[PDB]
Symmetry: C3
């Protein structure tokens, strides 16, 4: 129940340097492995830097605010190279970068294939995150994965808004439960059925010997629109009512 970001192709990767394109970040996913044919080179089972110093990195980014819950690193699958320690940096606004845990040096790998996982408690909240290898065996070469919370069903909703009124004297006389429907068409048709929230912004109504009774309900909601049912009861004479509505479409 966390998301493997690289496995799902959710993040753009950018390395500092690449030994060459056959050692690029595209070869860096956790457990990456390619042909065992020893007669041809189809790429390192790792990202491998070109320059060996303490300034190399891979930046992983996208526009969404991610809640990173863990990172896993691994050495290189096909040669004895691995990152033995690293630092992490991240940014929420893509302008100001901070060091994870005050520049903590994280102890990492000691062989080609064993996975080392660090859990973030609390999650790192970031748009971009960078692994900054500090020490290495033989070469700065690694495979990795970044784990994030799944997107919530309530995130990134679509919204259309409008207003609706009775607009005449339909409810301005009579006795007992009395209702009128105003059909509202959304400016644009939704892809799926939204919810429709409403709030009153005008009352022009007579009490029934002091009792005020008015109600609005959004009903018969479709992708194209909905009905605002205006309601009164007892003997109230309602002259006009106005609602603003906010139609919200989730998960689409």
């Amino acid at each position: 129940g966390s998301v493997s970001c690289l496995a799902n192709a959710l993040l753009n990767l950018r390395s500092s340097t690449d030994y060459n394109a056959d050692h690029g970040v595209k070869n860096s996913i956790l457990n990456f492995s390619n042909s065992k044919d020893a007669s041809r080179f189809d790429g390192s089972e790792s990202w491998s830097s070109s320059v060996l110093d303490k300034n190399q990195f891979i930046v992983a980014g996208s526009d969404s605010v991610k809640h990173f819950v863990a990172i896993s690193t691994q050495g290189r699958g096909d040669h004895d190279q691995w990152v033995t320690s690293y630092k992490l940096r991240y940014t929420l606004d893509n302008v100001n970068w901070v060091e994870y845990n005050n520049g903590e040096i994280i102890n990492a790998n000691k062989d080609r294939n064993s996975i080392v996982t660090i859990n973030f408690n609390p999650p790192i909240k970031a748009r971009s995150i960078a692994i900054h290898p500090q020490t290495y065996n033989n070469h700065i070469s690694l495979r990795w994965e970044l784990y994030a919370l799944p997107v919530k069903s309530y995130s990134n909703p679509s919204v259309q808004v409008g207003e609706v009124s009775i607009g005449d004297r339909s409810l301005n006389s009579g006795t007992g439960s009395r209702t009128i429907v105003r059909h509202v068409k959304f400016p644009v048709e939704f892809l799926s059925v939204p919810i429709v929230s409403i709030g009153c912004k005008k009352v022009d109504a007579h009490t029934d010997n002091g009792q005020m009774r008015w109600e609005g309900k959004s009903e018969n909601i479709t992708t194209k629109g909905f009905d605002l049912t205006f309601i009164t009861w007892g003997n109230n004479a309602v002259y006009d009512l106005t609602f603003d509505y906010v139609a919200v479409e989730f998960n689409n």
Copy 2:
């Protein structure tokens, strides 16, 4: 009126394996073609895998919920290699993957350049999607494009909220149409002019021989704020009114 996702650089791609970086997913867009100079190799006109089996794939992903309406595949431009059938997998939450149409094997290409397009009715709703070649002529090599519905103008809106009241006895006396304006400044200035929806959460008002009359309108909306015009008429004495507002900025 569909979006060519790869052409527009909207999706991250990740292959299972690459024959080498000069056969990577970066060379996989539909109709990809490079130099005709036979004296140098600038890359295959295809993604080409390294391992030939039924387990290769390209994953295409991003954070947004896409509605995929079609996929097109093509063989390799510069050699006689093409995928002859494939399966599709996808995921909406990036945790749970499903097979398209119960693992349907889709019949695909039979030459280098002819495009084979499959239409999805209904659209596949997904954050990530993967093509899983099953059979091939000579090598797992392909070019492709994924077509999605365009983003709606109502998607990803920006929102600020607040409340506003009369806050004094400005409307608590008098006859005829009577109005007061409260100017509201948004916590942060918007990039473009929002809409402003409102809903009443407090009425403290006297009826005019039984008739209740109150209204609020948001007016003079700018990037920086708006005016809440509080309104009464007839002889109503309105002591206070409060609205919550929801300012929504679209398409920005």
Copy 3:
């Protein structure tokens, strides 16, 4: 206070052609430099095209609407190649592309390393943007960066909605300030504390010798829910009230 898009790995890049993968767009970031070791080739300090004509490009894209404020270009770090002029194209909807400033040819670089920056007034509003080199010294080779406004704290909010009523005669008798709390649980727990906006959609209440007094407040908001405090005062007998609420979570 602008965002360096490529530095932060925020955009997918796609070139028209690459001299080969060691001259790909992955080597195109502004100021990109790799090993100075003259004995091995770890890639060009540039993207370099394969075909030399007026039809080459790099497309930079993602789903988010960006407000691009500037572009910077540079020639190739390790050889005497640079783009001397280019055009820009962009798209907001990823269907319809437009030429920047009526197809203006922008004067660009004249050496390997000096940066040439063009500022966009007003910002270019786009999901994808493409640099289209027109003329070049020796080869179409460049490094570049795209600068965008930072994301606003109000963008991409998460939203849950619902309704709440008194649902009994708790406020239907008595004198003075009288309140009841209805606890609302959000359908799903938020990651951080939201704001909760409310709007009345039903009044069933008696005036107090003509004075109407009712109020709702959202209070004690947590990640899990909030309290709708229903309020009356004076001697009003309130039979029922209903609010719709819109809970909005920012920056998460």
